[PDB]
Amino acid sequence: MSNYSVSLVGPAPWGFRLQGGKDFNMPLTISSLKDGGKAAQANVRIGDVVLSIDGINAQGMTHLEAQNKIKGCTGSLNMTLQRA
C-alpha cells in the first residue's frame, strides 16, 4: 500500500495493460507488462493500483477514460500508483 510515482519518457506504446475502472467495479490496476517495455523499465508491477494519471485522480474514471488519457498522453506519462 505504499505509493510511488513514474514519469515514463515517450513515445508510446508505454508497455502495459490495465483492468478495472468504474464500469468494472474495481480500481484501475496494472494487469500486464510488456517485457522490456517502458513501464517495466520503471519497475511498475502487475497488480499495482493506478491512483492518478496526469494529476487526475483515477477513482472516478472508466476503463476507457484511463486508456485514452494514457494513449493520448503528450510527452511523458506521469502516474502515481500504489504497490500491491
Residue ranges binding other proteins (CB under 8 A)? 12-18, 32, 34, 63, 67, 70-71
Interatomic CA distance for residues 84 and 77, integer angstroms: 20
Q: Of the two residues 18 and 61, which places its CB atom closer to other proteins in the complex?
A: 18
Instruction: In angstroms, give the least distance from the CB of 71 to other proteins.
Output: 6
Q: How many residues does the chain have?
A: 84
| Closer to other proteins by Cβ: residue 13 or 57 | 13
- Of the candidates 21, 10, 15, which has an alpha carbon nearest to the alpha carbon of residue 50? 21
- The nearer residue to other proteins, 19 or 82, going by C-beta atoms, is 19
Strands 49-53 and 77-82 turn out to be antiparallel
